[PDB]
Amino acid sequence: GHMASGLTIYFKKPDSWGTPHLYYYDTNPKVDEPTWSEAPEMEHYEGDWYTHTIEGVESVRLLFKDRGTNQWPGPGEPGFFRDQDGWFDGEWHVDRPG
Helix, strand or coil: CCCCCEEEEEEECCCCCCCEEEEEEEEECCCCCCCCCCCCECEEEECCEEEEEEECCCEEEEEEEECCCCEECCCCCCCEEECCCEEECCCEECCCCC
């Protein structure tokens, strides 16, 4: 068959945040998972939207963070579970809000 598949996630970065990164763990199927500090950069998409695709995954647990001390959630919170692509602005949407 075949194409590049997985979980695409778009993040509307808060303006106070520095460069956005995507931290994710318990992947399924199991795939190399990043360090908290080695989390992939979220490439700029448009406006305050940033994006990143985890290849090969059907579900993941995720948090957004910057290269400083910001994150969402939310110190003491577990990751967001996903399962599906991918637009977060404070709420999850499957397609771009608007």
